[PDB]
mmCIF file of all heavy atoms in Angstrom:
data_model
loop_
_atom_site.group_PDB
_atom_site.id
_atom_site.type_symbol
_atom_site.label_atom_id
_atom_site.label_comp_id
_atom_site.label_asym_id
_atom_site.label_seq_id
_atom_site.Cartn_x
_atom_site.Cartn_y
_atom_site.Cartn_z
ATOM 1 N N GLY A 1 0.828 -1.189 0.000
ATOM 2 C CA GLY A 1 0.000 0.000 0.000
ATOM 3 C C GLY A 1 0.865 1.242 0.000
ATOM 4 O O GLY A 1 0.538 2.248 -0.636
ATOM 5 N N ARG A 2 1.980 1.170 0.725
ATOM 6 C CA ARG A 2 2.985 2.219 0.728
ATOM 7 C C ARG A 2 4.403 1.689 0.595
ATOM 8 O O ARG A 2 5.315 2.481 0.339
ATOM 9 C CB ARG A 2 2.891 3.056 2.012
ATOM 10 C CG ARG A 2 3.645 2.462 3.184
ATOM 11 C CD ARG A 2 3.455 3.279 4.444
ATOM 12 N NE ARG A 2 4.473 2.966 5.440
ATOM 13 C CZ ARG A 2 5.529 3.731 5.688
ATOM 14 N NH1 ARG A 2 5.700 4.861 5.020
ATOM 15 N NH2 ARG A 2 6.411 3.372 6.610
ATOM 16 N N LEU A 3 4.617 0.386 0.759
ATOM 17 C CA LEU A 3 5.934 -0.227 0.673
ATOM 18 C C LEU A 3 5.970 -1.155 -0.533
ATOM 19 O O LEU A 3 5.063 -1.975 -0.719
ATOM 20 C CB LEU A 3 6.259 -1.002 1.951
ATOM 21 C CG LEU A 3 7.715 -1.409 2.166
ATOM 22 C CD1 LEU A 3 8.582 -0.183 2.380
ATOM 23 C CD2 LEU A 3 7.833 -2.363 3.342
ATOM 24 N N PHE A 4 7.012 -1.023 -1.348
ATOM 25 C CA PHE A 4 7.143 -1.778 -2.584
ATOM 26 C C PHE A 4 8.388 -2.650 -2.537
ATOM 27 O O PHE A 4 9.446 -2.215 -2.073
ATOM 28 C CB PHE A 4 7.207 -0.844 -3.796
ATOM 29 C CG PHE A 4 5.888 -0.226 -4.157
ATOM 30 C CD1 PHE A 4 5.387 0.842 -3.432
ATOM 31 C CD2 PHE A 4 5.150 -0.709 -5.223
ATOM 32 C CE1 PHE A 4 4.175 1.415 -3.762
ATOM 33 C CE2 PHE A 4 3.937 -0.139 -5.558
ATOM 34 C CZ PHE A 4 3.450 0.924 -4.827
ATOM 35 N N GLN A 5 8.251 -3.882 -3.017
ATOM 36 C CA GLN A 5 9.360 -4.823 -3.125
ATOM 37 C C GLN A 5 9.449 -5.281 -4.571
ATOM 38 O O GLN A 5 8.493 -5.859 -5.097
ATOM 39 C CB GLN A 5 9.167 -6.025 -2.195
ATOM 40 C CG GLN A 5 8.556 -5.689 -0.847
ATOM 41 C CD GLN A 5 9.601 -5.421 0.213
ATOM 42 O OE1 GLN A 5 10.720 -5.927 0.135
ATOM 43 N NE2 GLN A 5 9.242 -4.627 1.213
ATOM 44 N N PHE A 6 10.586 -5.021 -5.210
ATOM 45 C CA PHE A 6 10.795 -5.369 -6.607
ATOM 46 C C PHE A 6 11.723 -6.571 -6.707
ATOM 47 O O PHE A 6 12.697 -6.678 -5.958
ATOM 48 C CB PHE A 6 11.377 -4.188 -7.384
ATOM 49 C CG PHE A 6 10.629 -2.905 -7.178
ATOM 50 C CD1 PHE A 6 11.155 -1.898 -6.390
ATOM 51 C CD2 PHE A 6 9.396 -2.707 -7.773
ATOM 52 C CE1 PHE A 6 10.465 -0.719 -6.197
ATOM 53 C CE2 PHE A 6 8.703 -1.530 -7.586
ATOM 54 C CZ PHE A 6 9.237 -0.535 -6.797
ATOM 55 N N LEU A 7 11.421 -7.473 -7.639
ATOM 56 C CA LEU A 7 12.199 -8.692 -7.806
ATOM 57 C C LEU A 7 12.361 -8.990 -9.286
ATOM 58 O O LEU A 7 11.389 -8.938 -10.042
ATOM 59 C CB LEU A 7 11.523 -9.877 -7.104
ATOM 60 C CG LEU A 7 11.819 -11.264 -7.680
ATOM 61 C CD1 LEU A 7 13.166 -11.770 -7.198
ATOM 62 C CD2 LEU A 7 10.717 -12.247 -7.333
ATOM 63 N N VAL A 8 13.590 -9.294 -9.690
ATOM 64 C CA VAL A 8 13.899 -9.772 -11.033
ATOM 65 C C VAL A 8 14.602 -11.111 -10.865
ATOM 66 O O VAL A 8 15.710 -11.170 -10.320
ATOM 67 C CB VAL A 8 14.768 -8.782 -11.817
ATOM 68 C CG1 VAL A 8 15.007 -9.292 -13.226
ATOM 69 C CG2 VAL A 8 14.115 -7.410 -11.848
ATOM 70 N N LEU A 9 13.962 -12.185 -11.314
ATOM 71 C CA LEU A 9 14.465 -13.538 -11.124
ATOM 72 C C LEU A 9 14.830 -14.138 -12.474
ATOM 73 O O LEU A 9 13.977 -14.248 -13.361
ATOM 74 C CB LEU A 9 13.425 -14.404 -10.415
ATOM 75 C CG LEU A 9 13.702 -15.904 -10.332
ATOM 76 C CD1 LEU A 9 14.829 -16.202 -9.364
ATOM 77 C CD2 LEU A 9 12.446 -16.619 -9.910
ATOM 78 N N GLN A 10 16.092 -14.532 -12.623
ATOM 79 C CA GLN A 10 16.579 -15.207 -13.819
ATOM 80 C C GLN A 10 16.806 -16.676 -13.483
ATOM 81 O O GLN A 10 17.742 -17.017 -12.748
ATOM 82 C CB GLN A 10 17.862 -14.560 -14.334
ATOM 83 C CG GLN A 10 18.520 -15.345 -15.453
ATOM 84 C CD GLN A 10 19.460 -14.504 -16.288
ATOM 85 O OE1 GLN A 10 19.261 -13.300 -16.445
ATOM 86 N NE2 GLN A 10 20.492 -15.136 -16.833
ATOM 87 N N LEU A 11 15.936 -17.535 -14.007
ATOM 88 C CA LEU A 11 16.088 -18.976 -13.875
ATOM 89 C C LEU A 11 17.017 -19.493 -14.965
ATOM 90 O O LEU A 11 16.812 -19.212 -16.153
ATOM 91 C CB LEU A 11 14.727 -19.662 -13.970
ATOM 92 C CG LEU A 11 14.724 -21.188 -14.044
ATOM 93 C CD1 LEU A 11 14.745 -21.782 -12.650
ATOM 94 C CD2 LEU A 11 13.526 -21.691 -14.830
ATOM 95 N N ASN A 12 18.038 -20.251 -14.559
ATOM 96 C CA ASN A 12 19.033 -20.780 -15.479
ATOM 97 C C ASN A 12 19.124 -22.297 -15.496
ATOM 98 O O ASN A 12 19.655 -22.849 -16.467
ATOM 99 C CB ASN A 12 20.425 -20.218 -15.148
ATOM 100 C CG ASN A 12 20.424 -18.713 -14.996
ATOM 101 O OD1 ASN A 12 20.560 -17.979 -15.974
ATOM 102 N ND2 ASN A 12 20.277 -18.245 -13.766
ATOM 103 N N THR A 13 18.636 -22.986 -14.469
ATOM 104 C CA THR A 13 18.760 -24.432 -14.380
ATOM 105 C C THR A 13 17.410 -25.057 -14.059
ATOM 106 O O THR A 13 16.493 -24.396 -13.566
ATOM 107 C CB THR A 13 19.789 -24.847 -13.319
ATOM 108 O OG1 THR A 13 19.945 -26.271 -13.335
ATOM 109 C CG2 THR A 13 19.332 -24.414 -11.938
ATOM 110 N N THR A 14 17.299 -26.348 -14.357
ATOM 111 C CA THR A 14 16.115 -27.132 -14.034
ATOM 112 C C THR A 14 16.397 -28.291 -13.093
ATOM 113 O O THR A 14 15.520 -28.655 -12.308
ATOM 114 C CB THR A 14 15.464 -27.673 -15.317
ATOM 115 O OG1 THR A 14 15.409 -26.633 -16.300
ATOM 116 C CG2 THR A 14 14.050 -28.159 -15.036
ATOM 117 N N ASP A 15 17.590 -28.881 -13.149
ATOM 118 C CA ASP A 15 17.984 -29.903 -12.186
ATOM 119 C C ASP A 15 18.208 -29.250 -10.827
ATOM 120 O O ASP A 15 19.099 -28.409 -10.669
ATOM 121 C CB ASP A 15 19.236 -30.632 -12.665
ATOM 122 C CG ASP A 15 20.357 -29.685 -13.038
ATOM 123 O OD1 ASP A 15 20.078 -28.487 -13.252
ATOM 124 O OD2 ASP A 15 21.516 -30.140 -13.127
ATOM 125 N N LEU A 16 17.391 -29.624 -9.845
ATOM 126 C CA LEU A 16 17.420 -28.986 -8.539
ATOM 127 C C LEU A 16 17.646 -29.962 -7.395
ATOM 128 O O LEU A 16 17.757 -29.524 -6.243
ATOM 129 C CB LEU A 16 16.117 -28.211 -8.310
ATOM 130 C CG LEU A 16 15.781 -27.219 -9.427
ATOM 131 C CD1 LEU A 16 14.382 -26.674 -9.261
ATOM 132 C CD2 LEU A 16 16.792 -26.087 -9.460
ATOM 133 N N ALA A 17 17.719 -31.265 -7.672
ATOM 134 C CA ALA A 17 17.970 -32.234 -6.612
ATOM 135 C C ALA A 17 19.355 -32.040 -6.009
ATOM 136 O O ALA A 17 19.513 -32.021 -4.783
ATOM 137 C CB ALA A 17 17.810 -33.656 -7.153
ATOM 138 N N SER A 18 20.370 -31.896 -6.854
ATOM 139 C CA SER A 18 21.724 -31.659 -6.380
ATOM 140 C C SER A 18 21.928 -30.183 -6.066
ATOM 141 O O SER A 18 21.279 -29.307 -6.643
ATOM 142 C CB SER A 18 22.747 -32.115 -7.420
ATOM 143 O OG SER A 18 23.017 -31.084 -8.353
ATOM 144 N N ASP A 19 22.843 -29.913 -5.136
ATOM 145 C CA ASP A 19 23.172 -28.554 -4.726
ATOM 146 C C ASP A 19 24.574 -28.157 -5.185
ATOM 147 O O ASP A 19 25.222 -27.306 -4.572
ATOM 148 C CB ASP A 19 23.033 -28.415 -3.210
ATOM 149 C CG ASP A 19 22.874 -26.973 -2.762
ATOM 150 O OD1 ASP A 19 21.725 -26.483 -2.742
ATOM 151 O OD2 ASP A 19 23.891 -26.328 -2.428
ATOM 152 N N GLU A 20 25.056 -28.770 -6.264
ATOM 153 C CA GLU A 20 26.414 -28.548 -6.740
ATOM 154 C C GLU A 20 26.496 -27.807 -8.063
ATOM 155 O O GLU A 20 27.489 -27.120 -8.308
ATOM 156 C CB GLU A 20 27.152 -29.886 -6.878
ATOM 157 C CG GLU A 20 27.421 -30.596 -5.557
ATOM 158 C CD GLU A 20 27.752 -29.640 -4.425
ATOM 159 O OE1 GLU A 20 28.673 -28.810 -4.588
ATOM 160 O OE2 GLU A 20 27.087 -29.720 -3.371
ATOM 161 N N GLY A 21 25.481 -27.921 -8.916
ATOM 162 C CA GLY A 21 25.530 -27.312 -10.231
ATOM 163 C C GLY A 21 25.363 -25.807 -10.229
ATOM 164 O O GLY A 21 25.716 -25.132 -9.257
ATOM 165 N N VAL A 22 24.830 -25.270 -11.321
ATOM 166 C CA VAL A 22 24.613 -23.834 -11.447
ATOM 167 C C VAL A 22 23.314 -23.463 -10.748
ATOM 168 O O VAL A 22 22.346 -24.233 -10.749
ATOM 169 C CB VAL A 22 24.586 -23.422 -12.929
ATOM 170 C CG1 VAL A 22 24.777 -21.920 -13.072
ATOM 171 C CG2 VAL A 22 25.643 -24.181 -13.708
ATOM 172 N N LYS A 23 23.289 -22.280 -10.144
ATOM 173 C CA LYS A 23 22.104 -21.768 -9.478
ATOM 174 C C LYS A 23 21.542 -20.581 -10.250
ATOM 175 O O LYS A 23 22.247 -19.912 -11.007
ATOM 176 C CB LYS A 23 22.416 -21.358 -8.034
ATOM 177 C CG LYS A 23 23.759 -21.848 -7.516
ATOM 178 C CD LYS A 23 23.664 -23.252 -6.952
ATOM 179 C CE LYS A 23 24.977 -23.671 -6.312
ATOM 180 N NZ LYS A 23 24.915 -25.060 -5.783
ATOM 181 N N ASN A 24 20.248 -20.336 -10.056
ATOM 182 C CA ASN A 24 19.595 -19.188 -10.662
ATOM 183 C C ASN A 24 20.008 -17.909 -9.933
ATOM 184 O O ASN A 24 20.725 -17.935 -8.930
ATOM 185 C CB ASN A 24 18.080 -19.369 -10.636
ATOM 186 C CG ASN A 24 17.664 -20.804 -10.879
ATOM 187 O OD1 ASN A 24 18.108 -21.437 -11.833
ATOM 188 N ND2 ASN A 24 16.811 -21.327 -10.008
ATOM 189 N N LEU A 25 19.545 -16.768 -10.434
ATOM 190 C CA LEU A 25 19.876 -15.483 -9.836
ATOM 191 C C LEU A 25 18.602 -14.711 -9.521
ATOM 192 O O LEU A 25 17.579 -14.883 -10.186
ATOM 193 C CB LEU A 25 20.773 -14.656 -10.763
ATOM 194 C CG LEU A 25 22.197 -15.181 -10.948
ATOM 195 C CD1 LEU A 25 22.297 -16.039 -12.200
ATOM 196 C CD2 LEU A 25 23.191 -14.036 -11.000
ATOM 197 N N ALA A 26 18.668 -13.851 -8.508
ATOM 198 C CA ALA A 26 17.516 -13.028 -8.164
ATOM 199 C C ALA A 26 17.984 -11.710 -7.573
ATOM 200 O O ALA A 26 18.674 -11.698 -6.550
ATOM 201 C CB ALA A 26 16.594 -13.751 -7.178
ATOM 202 N N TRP A 27 17.593 -10.609 -8.208
ATOM 203 C CA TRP A 27 17.853 -9.266 -7.707
ATOM 204 C C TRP A 27 16.596 -8.775 -7.005
ATOM 205 O O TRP A 27 15.535 -8.673 -7.630
ATOM 206 C CB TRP A 27 18.227 -8.313 -8.841
ATOM 207 C CG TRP A 27 19.427 -8.719 -9.635
ATOM 208 C CD1 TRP A 27 20.693 -8.237 -9.507
ATOM 209 C CD2 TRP A 27 19.468 -9.680 -10.696
ATOM 210 N NE1 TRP A 27 21.524 -8.841 -10.418
ATOM 211 C CE2 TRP A 27 20.795 -9.733 -11.159
ATOM 212 C CE3 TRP A 27 18.511 -10.501 -11.297
ATOM 213 C CZ2 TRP A 27 21.190 -10.575 -12.194
ATOM 214 C CZ3 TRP A 27 18.904 -11.337 -12.322
ATOM 215 C CH2 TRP A 27 20.232 -11.368 -12.760
ATOM 216 N N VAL A 28 16.709 -8.470 -5.717
ATOM 217 C CA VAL A 28 15.562 -8.085 -4.901
ATOM 218 C C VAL A 28 15.840 -6.722 -4.285
ATOM 219 O O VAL A 28 16.664 -6.600 -3.370
ATOM 220 C CB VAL A 28 15.248 -9.124 -3.817
ATOM 221 C CG1 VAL A 28 13.924 -8.798 -3.144
ATOM 222 C CG2 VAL A 28 15.191 -10.514 -4.424
#
C-alpha cells in the first residue's frame, strides 16, 4: 500500500535435486 518490493528472477537451471551445479539469480 505504501511499501514496494521489486524482484527480477533469472532462472538458469532445471535440475534442482543436487546442490552442486549452477544456481539461478535473483535481484531483490
